[PDB]
Amino acid sequence: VDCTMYICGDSTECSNLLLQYGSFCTQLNRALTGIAVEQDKNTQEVFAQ
């Protein structure tokens, strides 16, 4: 999920305002990427033996 797009989208005023919330979007994106990588990790561990 794109945090900036989901919260604001194409609008620019909302995107500018959201910068006041620090790096919550970055943290959420990092967590989602970690989960996505972990999915492939589990798939490989279970199947690629």
The answer to whether 28 and 3 have CB atoms below 8 angstroms apart is: yes
| Spatial separation of the C-alpha atoms in residues 44 and 28, rounded to whole Å | 25
Binding mask 1-40 for other proteins (x = CB under 8 A): ----------------x--xxxx--xx-------------
As measured in angstroms, the least distance from the Cβ of 10 to other proteins is 21
Helix (H, G, I), strand (E, B) or coil at 10: coil
Give the distance, in angstroms, between the CA of residue 45 and the centroid of all CA atoms in the same chain.
24
Question: Residue 6 or residue 21: which is nearer to other proteins going by CB?
Answer: 21
Contact set with other proteins (CB under 8 A) = 17, 20-23, 26-27, 49
